[PDB]
Amino acid sequence: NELRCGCPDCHCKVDPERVFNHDGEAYCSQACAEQHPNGEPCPHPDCHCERS
Ligand SMILES: [Cd+2]
Ligand SMILES: [Cd+2]
Ligand SMILES: [Cd+2]
Ligand SMILES: [Cd+2]
């Protein structure tokens, strides 16, 4: 899968063509990269990862 979402709960295959690199990690979206700053889950209808 190469780039595996840095989010511990959220497992999404990330593409190096278009990946949000934050703090050196590859996340499926910036929401996971920013550790859900505003409180939004990732743009994938598989899970509902968010901070709590
Ligand atoms: Cd997720
Ligand atoms: Cd994610
Ligand atoms: Cd997440
Ligand atoms: Cd995702």
Tokens of 38: 């505003």
Report the C-alpha gap between 8 and 16 in whole angstroms. Answer: 19
Q: Are 6 and 32 in contact (CB under 8 A)?
A: yes
How would you write 2-26 as a 3-class SS string? CEECCCCCCCCEECCCCCEEECCEE
Tokens of 40: 């939004």
Q: Which residue has the tokens 């990690």?
A: 25
From the CA of 52, how far away is ligand 2's center (Å)? 15
Binding-site residue ranges: 5, 7, 10, 12, 28, 32, 36, 42, 47, 49
Tokens of 16: 């190096």
Binding-site residue ranges for Zn(2+): 5, 7, 10, 28, 32, 36, 42, 47, 49
> What method did the depositors use to determine the structure?
NMR
